Amino acid sequence: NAAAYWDGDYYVKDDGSKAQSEWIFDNYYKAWFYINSDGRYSQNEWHGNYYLKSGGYMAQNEWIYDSNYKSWFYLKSDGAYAHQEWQLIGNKWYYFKKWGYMAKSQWQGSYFLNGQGAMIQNEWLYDPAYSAYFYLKSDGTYANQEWQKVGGKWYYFKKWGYMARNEWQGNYYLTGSGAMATDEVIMDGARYIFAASGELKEKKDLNVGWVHRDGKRYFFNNREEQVGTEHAKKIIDISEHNGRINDWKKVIDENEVDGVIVRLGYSGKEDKELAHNIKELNRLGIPYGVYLYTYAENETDAENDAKQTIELIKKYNMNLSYPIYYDVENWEYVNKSKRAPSDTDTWVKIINKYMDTMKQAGYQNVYVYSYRSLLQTRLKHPDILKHVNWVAAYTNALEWENPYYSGEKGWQYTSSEYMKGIQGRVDVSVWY
């Protein structure tokens, strides 16, 4: 007489009565609908373990995004949401937490789910929480207590998946990058010779670095050769990243430090320890210079860097025995929105601007600091290189010449020295 039909939002059942608070299957649509207590079909909402989409159709074998929970959900073959379980969907593995929330950007035991919720396979993962590298294998599990060949190089993963670095594993040494050593490594006052396949061949004891010879002191690089003379100076650079230094006199005497380069901060921001560092060095009469890490992008930025530098110098009553350093590197913001110009000409302009501003303000003991590879590429210009007298190269020898600068200079040869009176690694240079 009038059965099994939709009357707007209402549904008339097999008999001839209105549906109410019940599931009905429509044969035309081949779909389930849940009819609410109001008599109307539910839509854009959950009912128990099931989701009713726009138009009322129960979701089955499909993803649903719920704006209320800001979460993806997956609805199984019977409509029930996936929860506390793994599902293979479109040839990828997904994990669903309690209440059906898709896991994303997190671990689930030995597996890691990316931002789209997919289990990672054959990929590197840095995890800040564990502050280390992991490698998720073909099966999705993190590599552990085993070797892995990745991108043509060999890596060792320890218990809990940690990538070994700067450490031994049997006859093999994992370098700073984590990759197996295949040639030579100088460390612990020794030279180590590895076969091309990685196993240690030979160990030779060396006496290198700062060596004390009968009342005198010299610096020897890793190729057992002298840098500078007996008057070579040990210069550290310090920043908030070294934490707070409570006993500066201890630091200076016990490590035989001749001077310090102190971080001012970076473009627009003052180093947290600058005030304390300047105060202490001033009071103790330790020779120091300073450096600003630049995030410049143009001449406006370069002028702002100099202005900031000048303000800080007068503010803290800085007494500068060593230069003011423009720390020039391949910078990038943490959110990666901006990164340094690549072209030589833009940096000629930036560096020239900074120098010119400093000069007109009365500061002429101003120089550029950078690392070797950059001075060889995007910085290789007579107008820049004329300002360079402090070069980083964490190598066995500097092996870099600068025709455009003559006189006293520094080589930052390490970022991993330990020193009495300081916690953690310290940057150290030889001045010569």
Ligand SMILES: C[N+](C)(C)CCO
């Ligand atoms: C329930 N539908 C929305 C599918 C049609 C009936 O109004």
Ligand SMILES: C[N+](C)(C)CCO
């Ligand atoms: C009617 N249920 C929704 C409970 C079963 C789905 O097929």
Ligand SMILES: C[N+](C)(C)CCO
């Ligand atoms: C992710 N897998 C389903 C492959 C294993 C988890 O138990």
Ligand SMILES: C[N+](C)(C)CCO
């Ligand atoms: C799937 N949720 C758990 C979010 C809704 C239950 O009705």
Ligand SMILES: C[N+](C)(C)CCO
């Ligand atoms: C729908 N997700 C993005 C959650 C995974 C499937 O692509």
Ligand SMILES: C[N+](C)(C)CCO
């Ligand atoms: C790889 N870790 C074991 C450190 C993370 C939890 O699975």
Ligand SMILES: C[N+](C)(C)CCO
């Ligand atoms: C193995 N990676 C090169 C990705 C990490 C270096 O620390």
